[PDB]
């Protein structure tokens, strides 16, 4: 429920600016947007890894990934009218600095496509159902 809530909030805050409304952009820059995005990325880094392990709860992983997707889409729509020496970029970069750990974990989880590449070496007929030990071997 909260995932859908914050998703709708992000969608509104994009459509304020998805047509590049400059006063809206400057208000969002001079705000607590980044103190929210840091905690969002913290929980994404932890729970994406923590939840990917268990196959019992995978729909929540999809929902959280879509939430993170719409958040980075907001961060892109912050940069439609992105000036070269832009302040929006600078504040985004301060945000990107203070939570480098979680960025590293998210990128490293996304080191992954690179899981069917290591599949045909021990496949009997290219089926899809190779052994778990063939998988660890591969």
């Amino acid at each position: 429920k909260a995932i859908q809530v914050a998703k709708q909030v992000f969608n509104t805050l994009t459509e304020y600016i998805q047509g590049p409304c400059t006063g809206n952009q400057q208000s969002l820059a001079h705000s607590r947007l980044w103190d929210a995005v840091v905690g969002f990325l913290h929980v994404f880094a932890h729970m994406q890894m923590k939840l990917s392990q268990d196959s019992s709860q995978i729909e929540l992983l999809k929902e959280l990934m879509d939430l993170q997707k719409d958040m980075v889409v907001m961060l892109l729509s912050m940069l439609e009218g992105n000036v070269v020496n832009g302040t929006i970029g600078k504040q985004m970069v301060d945000m990107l600095v203070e939570s480098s750990n979680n960025v590293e974990m998210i990128l490293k989880f996304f080191d992954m496509l690179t899981s069917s590449d290591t599949f045909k070496e021990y496949d009997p007929d290219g089926k899809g159902v190779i052994s778990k030990r063939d998988f660890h071997k591969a």
Side-chain angles (χ1 to χ4, degrees):
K1 60 185 206 64
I3 292 287
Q4 292 179 28
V5 163
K7 196 209 305 207
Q8 202 73 25
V9 174
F10 277 132
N11 296 7
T12 66
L13 281 146
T14 64
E15 286 283 8
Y16 297 167
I17 280 158
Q18 189 165 2
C21 191
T22 64
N24 297 357
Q25 287 214 122
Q26 294 292 285
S27 49
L28 298 199
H30 313 327
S31 68
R32 303 287 302 290
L33 172 53
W34 324 116
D35 289 311
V37 167
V38 296
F40 267 101
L41 295 157
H42 179 96
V43 62
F44 294 153
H46 290 80
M47 280 298 333
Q48 180 152 31
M49 298 193 288
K50 206 179 88 82
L51 186 62
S52 46
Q53 304 283 32
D54 304 329
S55 279
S56 84
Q57 296 178 119
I58 51 166
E59 285 76 8
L60 174 57
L61 181 69
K62 298 294 109 177
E63 297 144 37
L64 196 69
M65 263 196 261
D66 300 343
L67 169 54
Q68 183 164 21
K69 175 171 161 50
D70 271 24
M71 189 168 78
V72 296
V73 169
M74 164 270 295
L75 297 155
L76 287 161
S77 190
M78 283 299 304
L79 303 156
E80 284 186 16
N82 185 223
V83 180
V84 169
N85 185 77
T87 68
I88 286 159
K90 285 179 174 147
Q91 297 163 26
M92 193 175 285
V93 163
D94 304 359
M95 174 270 297
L96 289 155
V97 163
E98 191 160 1
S99 302
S100 176
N101 50 336
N102 311 118
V103 170
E104 167 48 36
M105 313 333 290
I106 291 154
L107 294 161
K108 191 174 68 60
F109 168 77
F110 282 155
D111 304 348
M112 172 162 64
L113 300 178
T114 72
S115 303
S116 177
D117 302 357
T118 179
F119 207 90
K120 66 192 76 58
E121 315 314 322
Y122 312 134
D123 218 323
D125 63 308
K127 174 47 58 179
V129 301
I130 66 186
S131 176
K132 171 54 62 57
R133 296 294 89 190
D134 283 16
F135 203 78
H136 169 267
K137 189 189 288 186

